[PDB]
């Protein structure tokens, strides 16, 4: 029932160093929470990096090390490569149970940052036909990968009732599509006005709405 | 070479059951304790529990201990998952691992999905367009199992579409978009249509997406 | 002898 705290994101550069940590909810990390981590690249490809806190999985390059930073476990990457680009779990041991993080989307500049372009579509004549709305929010082409869509609808923040999903890497130009689905009956969707996406992202100053009313 | 070698997975109802196996080689598996997470969207890792080589301390995460077990034969080098009352949010990908110092070496992933669906073909709802890029698409919603293709104008558009992975509902069913951007100008005197077949139902839809 | 486990 413990939570262990990761940061959501980082971003670095090639050749720089970066330091990734991990926090427990019960007190300060220690050596006997025996901390792990693990990258997980794309294609579910997960490699095992340090155990026990300080301990490389054989193989593992030496520019990845475990440590203790105050409270927390740590995992610093030095000359940082844009292989690196990955997501890292760290993994805490309570006795008899480990518990993982929620992971930290490391990001390692492959280019210069793109913010996303944002379309909003709402649910059409003929969904609402079939008696459900679905609003679709689309964040095109951005990079890093790391972005907060919120709903709003008639100024009121939504929780619950909406799924995202995201594409893979582009190959050639290193960005990343979004869509985040808002689904309500068509009932509640008539219960309501305004409908707005609101796109957080290191590439944008202040946030960005698209929002249009029923 | 060592290969953790995954097999077992696929559907399940609610309530149902399923055992899942990893068949290790290139090590010496007498030798490894051994361990199962799981992956799912949103749910991060998870480590479900690991098992001593003499199988006299299996450890848990509590909260999966009722309905999980975890076992092992090591004359046949295999190492076995039990779910059992399964539900909807136990839907991930299943992951064997063995330890070697931290988690050293990984199968490749089982996946288990829970639903109650049946067999459904998709509704397809155009997303139309409303700068100098427009973005269009079509809503694949309500399909049961996967996959379903989308293709635009049979084909011959696909610069800049983008498919999105389906996501699995609360209902058991799911749902997928198709988007595409083309010139603002272009809207109106070129035509775009969503091509989307689901197999399992027999169901081949084209739907014309138009920007009113 | 047993390979290292990823705690004590
Ligand atoms: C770390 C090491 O060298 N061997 C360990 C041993 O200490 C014990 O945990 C054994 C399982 O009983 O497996 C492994």
Known sequence: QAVVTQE???????????TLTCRSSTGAVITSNYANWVQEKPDHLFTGLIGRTYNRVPGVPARFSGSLIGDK?????????????????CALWYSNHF??????????????????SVFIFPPSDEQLKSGTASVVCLLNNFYPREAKVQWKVDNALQSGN??????????????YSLSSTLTLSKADYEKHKVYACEVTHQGLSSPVTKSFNR | ????????????????????????????????????????????????GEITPDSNTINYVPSLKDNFGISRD???????????????????????????????????????????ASTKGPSV????????????????????????????????????????????????????????????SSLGTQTYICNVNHKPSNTKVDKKVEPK | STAPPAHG
């Open chain 2, 125 to 184: 709802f155009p997303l139309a367009p409303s700068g100098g890029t427009a973005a269009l698409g079509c809503l694949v919603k309500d399909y049961f199992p996967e996959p379903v293709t989308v293709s635009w104008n049979s084909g011959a558009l696909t610069s800049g579409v983008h498919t999105f992975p389906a996501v699995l509902q609360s209902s058991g069913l799911y749902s997928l978009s198709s988007v595409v951007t083309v010139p603002s």
């Open chain 1, 8 to 18: 959501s994101a980082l971003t670095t550069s090639p050749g720089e160093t970066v």
């Open chain 2, 74 to 116: 090591n004359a046949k080098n295999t190492l076995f998952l039990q779910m059992t009352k399964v539900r909807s949010e136990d839907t991930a990908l299943y992951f064997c691992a063995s330890y070697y110092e931290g988690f050293a070496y990984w199968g490749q992933g089982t996946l288990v999905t829970v639903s109650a």
């Open chain 2, 1 to 48: 070479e060592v290969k953790l070698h995954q097999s077992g997975g696929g559907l399940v109802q609610p309530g149902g059951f399923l055992k899942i196996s990893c068949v290790v080689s290139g090590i010496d598996f007498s030798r490894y304790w051994m361990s199962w997470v799981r992956r799912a969207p949103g749910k991060g890792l998870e480590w479900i």
């Open chain 1, 99 to 116: 518990v993982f993080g929620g992971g930290t989307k490391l990001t390692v500049l492959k280019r210069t940052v793109a913010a996303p």
């Open chain 1, 73 to 89: 476990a740590a995992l610093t990457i030095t000359g940082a490569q844009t292989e690196d680009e990955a997501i890292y779990f």
């Open chain 1, 162 to 175: 909406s799924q995202e999903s995201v594409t893979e890497q582009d190959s050639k130009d290193s960005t």
